[PDB]
Every structure is written in C-alpha cells, then in structure tokens.
C-alpha cells in the first residue's frame, strides 16, 4: 500500500556545466563548484559538483534519496552525470556547512539566527518525516548554508524509507533501531552543537562508553547562552523512551515563539559577469 515515487532522475551531458574550483577531497572523491548552463536555456546556475567500485551503488541511493525530496530546508538533486566518472549535480551552499559556519563565526551570531537555525532545521526534518523517510546522520556538519537565513538539511546517504556514536539515539546504539523518535534525539545533540557554537558533545569520551553513560542518566551539559527553557527541550530530546520526546512539528512550534522574542530564551555577550545567473532554487522544471 505504497505511493509511486514519481520522481524525475535528469540527466546532464557534462558540456552543459564547467567546473570552477575544487571545495575538497577524500574518500568519496572530489566535490567541485561550477556552473550548469542548461541545453538552451539563458540561465548559468552555481551548483557542487560531487566525483571506482561499488561506491557506485551509494551514490546512486543518495540521488534516489535526493531526487525524491523537495522542500525549502532540505538539498534536493537537479541530475546526474553518467561520464566514467558518477557525478551528483546539487545546488550549490556557498557558506559551506552550519558546524564551520558557527565556529567561524562564533562573535557575530546572535539569538535570532541561532533560533531560526533550529526552526528551519526541524522544519526540514518534519518534511522528511512526512515522507516517511529516516535521516539516520542528522548533525551540525550535515546543514548546509545557502544564506546566512537560510540552511537545508543534506547528506542522505544512510538514509531509510522506514556509526556517529555521540548523535544517536540510545535504542540505536544498543538495537540497531531508527525511528523518527531516534533522529529527534539528533536534533537534540545538533542543537546543542549550535549554543555552544560548535563543541564537540561528549569531547574526550571514548565511543565505546556512550551507551552506558547514557544508560546511567548523563546528557550534554546545559550550554552557557541557553535559558532552562531551551535546555529543556533539548533534554526532552534525550528521554530514553522514544515517544515521550518531542514530534518535529513540535519543536517547530516551540521555537517559532521563542525566534519572536530571541533574547528571553538566548543570553550572548553583546548579542564577474554574472548576468544571466539564477538560483537554482528559482529554477523550477515542470
Ligand atoms: C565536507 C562538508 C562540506 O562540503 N563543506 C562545504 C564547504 C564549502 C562549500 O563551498 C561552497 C560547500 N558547498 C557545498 C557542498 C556540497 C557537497 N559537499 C559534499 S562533501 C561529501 N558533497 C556535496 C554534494 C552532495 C551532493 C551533490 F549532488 C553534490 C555535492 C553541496 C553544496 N554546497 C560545502
């Protein structure tokens, strides 16, 4: 009794784009950014263009993924490329990732941003959840930053339609078992990753020992700009039963109202020739 995923997987010819700069290397391979052109189309859009064994079988789940999704706070895929080479063609999230964002940025961010983050943050995951889709990696550094306003969930490569040790969910550790109860437990640690401008939760804790500190009741500790009224979502977050935590589209509502007063629940010191060049967020395909 499941919907058709009539989703449309484009493909590009590789002359339709021209790489600009490499952003990084690794396992994976090279992710690049560039502009598409598409066929005859007027329009130049900034994209990353993500570059020899079943490897291609995961980038190929993580377009599926990508290309069955469309919301403003998730990545979503414009096509692919089938050179020797699999290329993802995404749009391109020209502030990098939230975690490097708030670390690089720590004396300029103040309470309106750090409450619209997570409001958009679980906005993003509410969709994926309607979609029935389980995220399984939610973390700071898997947030992508199109505008300072603006960020989108992305990385979907362990994705389900129903190991980061530190951002899982206890049931996860011990069972193996991902619910949308369990990536609510992420959103919690990523919250707290972005109070306490990019921290790593549980530094210098062994991986090893998270399941039993967990299990004898420790947390993350209260980061110094929360208010207990944040803190406290953040730990219901955290409960060791999956249905006594918050639903995405609660947290939404609760940190809507506390972004129109932003420094009641936040206390911080002090707080080219690019002529025909669109957003891809502005490109819509029928
Ligand atoms: C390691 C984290 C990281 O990438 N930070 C970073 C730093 C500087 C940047 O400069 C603009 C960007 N921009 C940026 C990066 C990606 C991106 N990235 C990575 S990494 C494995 N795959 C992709 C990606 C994923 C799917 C695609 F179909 C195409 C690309 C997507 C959009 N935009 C990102």
Known sequence: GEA??????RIL?????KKIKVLGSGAFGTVYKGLWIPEGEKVKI???IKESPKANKEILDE???????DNPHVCRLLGICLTSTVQLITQLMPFGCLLDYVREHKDNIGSQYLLNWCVQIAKGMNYLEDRRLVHRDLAARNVLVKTPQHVKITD???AKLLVPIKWMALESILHRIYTHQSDVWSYGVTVWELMTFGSKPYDGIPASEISSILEKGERLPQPPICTIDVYMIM???????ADSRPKFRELIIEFSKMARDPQR???IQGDEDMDDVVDADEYLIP
């Open 63 to 69: 377009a599926y993924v990508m290309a069955s999704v």
């Open 235 to 241: 730990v219901k977050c955290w409960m060791i039963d």
């Open 13 to 17: 010819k590789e002359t339709e784009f």
């Open 265 to 267: 629940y936040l206390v």
């Open 46 to 48: 900034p994209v990353a």
């Open 156 to 158: 979907f490569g362990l």
């Open 4 to 9: 058709p995923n009539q989703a449309l997987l």
